[PDB]
Amino acid sequence: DTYKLILNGKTLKGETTTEAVDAATAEKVFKQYAXDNGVDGEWTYDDATKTFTVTE
Predict the structure, then answer these.
(1) Would you give the distance in Å from CA 54 to the centre of its chain?
(2) What are phi and psi of 55, to 5 degrees?
(3) Coiled-coil regions in this chain?
(4) Which domain holds residue 14?
(5) Minimal CA–CA distance to 3: which of 35, 11, 24, 32?
(6) How many domains, in total, are found in the chain?
(7) Three-class SS of residue 56?
């Protein structure tokens, strides 16, 4: 299904999606994407909304 990543970083801000079979695939894309974008913050996940949040 479609999973969402909400980025609230110092310089990086946005919302992206990915297509994954499960959230624990989605996390290991998002936790790559957040690497590529040098994001180092606190992560939360809400299953009801299939949304990841990372906050520097």
Answers:
(1) 6
(2) -130, 110
(3) none
(4) 1-56
(5) 24
(6) 1
(7) coil
Instruction: Note the resolution in Å, 1 decimal.
Output: 1.8
d(CA 37, CA 47): 24
Residue 51 sits in a domain of what CATH number? Answer: 3.10.20.10
Rounded distance, CA 13 to CA 54, Å?
10
Helix, strand, coil content of the chain in percent (nearest 5): 30, 45, 25
Q: Identify the experimental approach.
A: X-ray
Report how far residue 2's alpha carbon sits from residue 18's, in angstroms, rounded to the nearest whole number: 6
Task: Supply 1's token pair.
Answer: 């299904």
